[PDB]
Amino acid sequence: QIIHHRNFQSQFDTTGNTLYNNAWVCSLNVIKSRDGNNYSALEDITSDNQAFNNILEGIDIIECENLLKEMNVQKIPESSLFTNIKEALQAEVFNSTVEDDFESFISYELQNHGPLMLIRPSLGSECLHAECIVGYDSEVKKVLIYDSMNTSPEWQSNIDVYDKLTLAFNDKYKNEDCSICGLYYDGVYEPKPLH
Amino acid sequence: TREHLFKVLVIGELGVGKTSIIKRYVHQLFSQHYRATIGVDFALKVLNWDSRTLVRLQLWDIAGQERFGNMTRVYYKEAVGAFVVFDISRSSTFEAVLKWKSDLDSKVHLPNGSPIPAVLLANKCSQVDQFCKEHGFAGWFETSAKDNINIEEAARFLVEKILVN
Ligand SMILES: Nc1nc2c(ncn2[C@@H]2O[C@H](COP(=O)(O)OP(=O)(O)O)[C@@H](O)[C@H]2O)c(=O)[nH]1
Ligand SMILES: [Mg+2]
């Protein structure tokens, strides 16, 4: 229903046989770029950065925390819907009303604050991961996900994206007091008028 | 010529060596230090299985969920193999094997109704007691992440079983 035209980048190489830890680069490039172009992150990655194009590990938490400030990437503002979702994530419920609020929370943020980046614990690794929410479709109840681990953008179900938000907002899963986990957005994003 | 993408889960109780097995197999590395970083959602190993077939192997570390035992849909989704890991020289983790295996077979299975191949890994380097394989394990290995003794062969055994399906 509502989709942002943002370019997709994979943290795999062209042949697909190499997995770089570039999720932090790809995710940042999604929310900072516009009109399907690439953001001028060449200055950060190309500058002999040990985190870029690395097989072993990516960027450090404390280093990435500063990087987000430099690039004007803040955590999404507080809101009532956001509180409802977080309260539901702590209980891990996903009934009819929680999904109604999820639909409203996703669709509001994408309209008013643009694409969102999700810093969350990785599902299959002891590190953190970054993926982006770029659109939503209220007819099929799906949300457009930019996950650099995949080959392309994917329309993933709300229950599946909800289960992934849980990792970032439920103390059961986030450990070592990693305060960098959460939902981010581009600070210089300017929403279009409603009418 | 063919190319395969296989997703396998590495599950087990805390402190058995799940991450060290993945770290040894994928990165040729075994270290004691830890770096909190932002990188990938899982690990990848690519194998030139034979002259025509190529296998891309995704190793999904259970990671935090290990402390609770229950698996989320987004984690076990579409898994075709599994490594159930326990710590030998510690009886506490061998008891939990049956708990991890039962939870595995109930959540994910083959598209034809059969259980996914699962290999039991006795990490940190009794042999008559391979009757535990009656629980649905395709095989077992004595592995060591420090010395790299059987992790290579244990992985090829799982890929082989997956490739028959
Ligand atoms: N001696 C020995 N120690 C190991 C081996 N594998 C893991 N460890 C140790 O077991 C501890 C925890 O292992 P870990 O990788 O965290 O297992 P996990 O918690 O299930 O992911 C670490 O301090 C390792 O040094 C091994 O093959 N040999
Ligand atoms: Mg571990």
Residue numbers in the entry:
A (entry chain A): 23 to 217
B (entry chain B): 21 to 145, 156 to 195
The authors write:
Rab32 is involved in controlling the biogenesis of lysosome-related organelles (LRO).
The high affinity of GtgEC45A for Rab32:GDP allowed us to purify thecomplex. The X-ray structures of the complexes were solved by the molecular replacement technique using the coordinates of Rab32:GppCH2p (PDB ID: 4CYM17) and truncated GtgE (PDB ID: 4MI77) as appropriate search models. The average B-factor of the full-length complex is higher than for the truncated complex, though the entire electron density is well defined for both structures.
